[PDB]
Amino acid sequence: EVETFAFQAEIAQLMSLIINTFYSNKEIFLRELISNSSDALDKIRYESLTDPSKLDSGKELHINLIPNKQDRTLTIVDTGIGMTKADLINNLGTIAKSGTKAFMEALQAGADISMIGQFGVGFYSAYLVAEKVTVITKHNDDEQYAWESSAGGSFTVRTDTGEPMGRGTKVILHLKEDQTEYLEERRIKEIVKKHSQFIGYPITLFVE
Amino acid sequence: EVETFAFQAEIAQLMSLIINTFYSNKEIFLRELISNSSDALDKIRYESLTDPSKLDSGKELHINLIPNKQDRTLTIVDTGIGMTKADLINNLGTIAKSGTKAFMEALQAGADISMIGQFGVGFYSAYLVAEKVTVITKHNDDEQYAWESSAGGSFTVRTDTGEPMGRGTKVILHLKEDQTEYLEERRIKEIVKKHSQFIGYPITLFVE
Ligand SMILES: Cc1n[nH]c2cc(O)ccc12
Ligand SMILES: Cc1n[nH]c2cc(O)ccc12
């Protein structure tokens, strides 16, 4: 029922660099995850231009931000293209091996961590705040999967029989104990307004 | 042999806004076209991860910048995924209708033209310097096409029997008479170094 995989060596180093580098500007994780969602929404929209029935699984194109102080999770949900099982395994649809190379040679030439999305690996910036990330996903061409990792070199994949979601991707951030400021309405609002002001899909900040 | 099309009304307004607005920071056209090329190179690279024979049409992943003072053209060539005929017609592979909407509502809320790539329509920033743009393209799944437009509401598409290119996209900028600074080695170098410093594909600036 549960398959366990090793990260390729370069992605493992990336996750370790993100987890271990002292670096105060952690809030960028939210800009990078919203921009990933917006990329995935563009994709299903582009496809729908020539095949309308692609949107049979959900016509609404949006992003929701769901904080939960009980479980200490911040959840980012989008109704984008979603990912097939193969995509989840190939580093959540990214060119993460070459992306990490470029990001590392940029760090060598005086870039800082906030430029991580330039290299196609901004997803891994989740590990600035999250001790565990769970990705639930559904692409039209495949069934619903759950990916999970607490870093340390491996991730799991399983077919997900949780809440049927129609089409898209939920990123569930299980926050580090010292990072619960990102569950605060006010703090989330400020970040979105600061870094994601002109995203072309409605972003709804849920309240508790 | 030559088919002629009308731009959708929103893309037509976008091109007219770009052509007619007084706006001095024109050099951004090069950052936006290099970032489009880099997106297209990511795509063929991602595909090759699961199907290696996708790279049968060219294993090299690069970007070349070719100025020519005789014809007054600056050419951007990439060996990315390239575009099918359908893609050329659907606004060169972009979600240009909704992208223009978002870009326009951003201009209303105090964004400036340099943020155009945030909305998926940075290609049209070519019309800051070019009186005519010619796009030659070859995607693995289709034959080689030429798209052309001098704006004014229409574009052409034809199967291209010019120089067989293997796989990718050439954007040929026929520069406005007052914009030949972009044919200067020194000026091109400065722009690339300023705006495209950390692109993960080698960029070669050709010399004359
Ligand atoms: C990767 C990745 N991070 N966040 C995402 C959201 C998506 O909808 C698809 C992929 C990703
Ligand atoms: C659109 C567009 N502008 N420049 C490009 C280069 C490409 O390789 C593909 C698409 C575009």
CA A31 – CA A172 distance, rounded (Å): 15
Q: How was this structure determined?
A: X-ray
Our answer on whether the CB atom of A169 is closer than 6 Å to any ligand 1 atom is: yes
Q: Following DSSP, what letter does each residue of B7-49 receive, concatenated?
A: PPHHHHHHHHHHHHS--S-TTHHHHHHHHHHHHHHHHHHHHHT
Amino acid, single-letter form, for residue B33? L
* A95 within 8 A of B49, measured Cβ to Cβ: yes
* Sign of the alpha-carbon torsion through B101, B102, B106, B107: negative
3-state secondary structure of A33: helix
B200 contacts chain A (CB < 8 A): yes
CB count within 10 Å of CB B188 equals 20
Tell me the three-class secondary structure of A138-187, residue by residue.
Answer: ECCCCCCEEEEECCCCEEEEEECCCCCCCCEEEEEEEECCCCHHHHCHHH
Task: Tell me how far CA of residue B111 lies from CA of A164, A198, B25, B119, in angstroms.
Answer: 39, 9, 14, 12
Closest ligand 2 atom to the C-alpha of B80?
8
Beta bridge partners of A137: A145, A169
Mutational test site, ligand 1, from A123, A139, A144, A173, max ligand atoms within 8 Å of CB: A123
Q: How far is B71 from chain A (nearest CA, A)?
A: 34
Angle (CA) B27 A194 A202, round 5°: 95
Query: Who lines ligand 2 at CB under 6 A?
Result: B 33, 36-37, 40, 78, 80, 83, 92-94, 123, 169, 171
Distance CA A78, CA A81 (A): 9
Enter the resolution in angstroms.
2.1
Q: What is the CATH number of the domain that holds A63?
A: 3.30.565.10
Domain that holds residue B165: 1-208
Domain total of chain A: 1
